[PDB]
Amino acid sequence: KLHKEPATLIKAIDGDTIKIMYKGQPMTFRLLLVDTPETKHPKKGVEKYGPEASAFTKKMLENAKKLEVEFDKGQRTDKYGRGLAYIYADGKMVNEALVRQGLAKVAYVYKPNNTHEQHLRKSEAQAKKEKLNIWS
């Protein structure tokens, strides 16, 4: 069953990509199942809510007493060598918080990495009904 492990923030890069110290090593992590608008983009530039999703993630992680990472049951790294996980700040999942606030859409899902898909989908529909940010 999925279990949490300790990690240490190094640097938030943007809304859904962060650098953390994981088991002694610095790595880049990508937040599972969510897409935040982009600040660092090749073609297009800062997308709308990009700067916002990324301040959110930054504040949430920097203010936490405790950071934990939760791997899903599939591949734990993507083709760019980024960890793939659910991230928790004092017990609150960053991935769901982003979605609940209308600052992320639920991503395209790849089984078997999809254990919190329903919950997340729950929160996105609520942010939709409340027409928050993305959904305004």
Swiss-Prot record:
Subcellular compartments: Secreted
Disordered, as annotated region: 116-136
Residues noted as binding Ca(2+) in the record, renumbered to the chain: D16, D35, T36
Compositional bias per record (Basic and acidic residues), positions renumbered to this chain: 116-132
Residues forming the catalytic site: R30, E38, R82
Name of this chain's protein: Nuclease A
Lineage: Bacteria, Bacillati, Bacillota, Bacilli, Bacillales
Recorded name of the encoding gene: nuc
Stretch of the intact protein here: 88 to 223 of 231
